[PDB]
Amino acid sequence: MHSDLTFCEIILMEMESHDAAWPFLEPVNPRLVSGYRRIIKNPMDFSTMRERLLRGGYTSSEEFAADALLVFDNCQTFNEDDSEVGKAGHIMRRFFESRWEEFY
Ligand SMILES: CCc1c(-c2csc(N=C(N)N)n2)[nH]c(C)c1C(C)=O
Ligand SMILES: [Mg+2]
């Protein structure tokens, strides 16, 4: 749908610009994060969804939502809930779930 994916733009822009978005704008650099490659099989981040979305690489809004949920799953997999990335991921995750349900 044009509408299904016109909305994925709105929310991704809103995540891209959220105060808590800083852990997720770029891919995690495994050279700098010991253990990340080993633990996180499928990395995901906002710039990667942005690339895929501009490219037309999403066919349904469900695919987009899967990529968003994967950012936060990988976050909670790797970081303790009281870590700084962890605290930021809970804010970004709660923002995403609520903004996504407000539409669907
Ligand atoms: C802790 C590193 C990390 C960042 C990140 C972005 S920027 C930065 N470093 C400073 N602000 N010093 N860390 N993002 C995610 C999703 C991470 C992990 C391992 O899950
Ligand atoms: Mg889940």
UniProtKB/Swiss-Prot annotation:
- Describe PTMs of this protein: Deacetylation by SIRT1 in late S phase enhances pRNA-binding, allowing de novo DNA methylation and heterochromatin formation. Acetylation is high during S phase and declines to background levels in late S phase when the silent copies of rRNA genes are replicated. Ubiquitinated. Deubiquitinated by USP21 leading to its stabilization.
Q: Indicate where this protein resides in the cell.
A: Nucleus, Nucleolus
Tell me the superkingdom of the source: Eukaryota
Tissue specificity: Expressed at moderate levels in most tissues analyzed, including heart, brain, placenta, lung, skeletal muscle, kidney and pancreas.
What residue stretches are annotated with the Bromo domain? 2-103
Q: Return the similarity comment.
A: Belongs to the WAL family.
Subunit composition and interactions: Component of the NoRC-1 ISWI chromatin remodeling complex at least composed of SMARCA1 and BAZ2A/TIP5, which regulates the spacing of histone octamers on the DNA template to facilitate access to DNA. Within the NoRC-1 ISWI chromatin remodeling complex interacts with SMARCA1; the interaction is direct. Component of the NoRC-5 ISWI chromatin remodeling complex (also called the NoRC nucleolar-remodeling complex), at least composed of SMARCA5/SNF2H and BAZ2A/TIP5, which regulates the spacing of histone octamers on the DNA template to facilitate access to DNA.
Domain comment from the record reads as follows: The bromo domain and the PHD-type zinc finger recognize and bind histone H4 acetylated on 'Lys-16' (H4K16ac). These 2 domains play a central role in the recruitment of chromatin silencing proteins such as DNMT1, DNMT3B and HDAC1. The MBD (methyl-CpG-binding) domain, also named TAM domain, specifically recognizes and binds a conserved stem-loop structure the association within pRNA. Binding to pRNA induces a conformational change of BAZ2A/TIP5 and is essential for targeting the NoRC complex to the nucleolus.
Q: What is the recorded function of this protein according to its Swiss-Prot or TrEMBL entry?
A: Regulatory subunit of the ATP-dependent NoRC-1 and NoRC-5 ISWI chromatin remodeling complexes, which form ordered nucleosome arrays on chromatin and facilitate access to DNA during DNA-templated processes such as DNA replication, transcription, and repair. Both complexes regulate the spacing of nucleosomes along the chromatin and have the ability to slide mononucleosomes to the center of a DNA template. Directly stimulates the ATPase activity of SMARCA5 in the NoRC-5 ISWI chromatin remodeling complex.
The molecule here is called Bromodomain adjacent to zinc finger domain protein 2A
Q: Specify the species.
A: Homo sapiens (Human)
Upper lineage is:
Eukaryota, Metazoa, Chordata, Craniata, Vertebrata
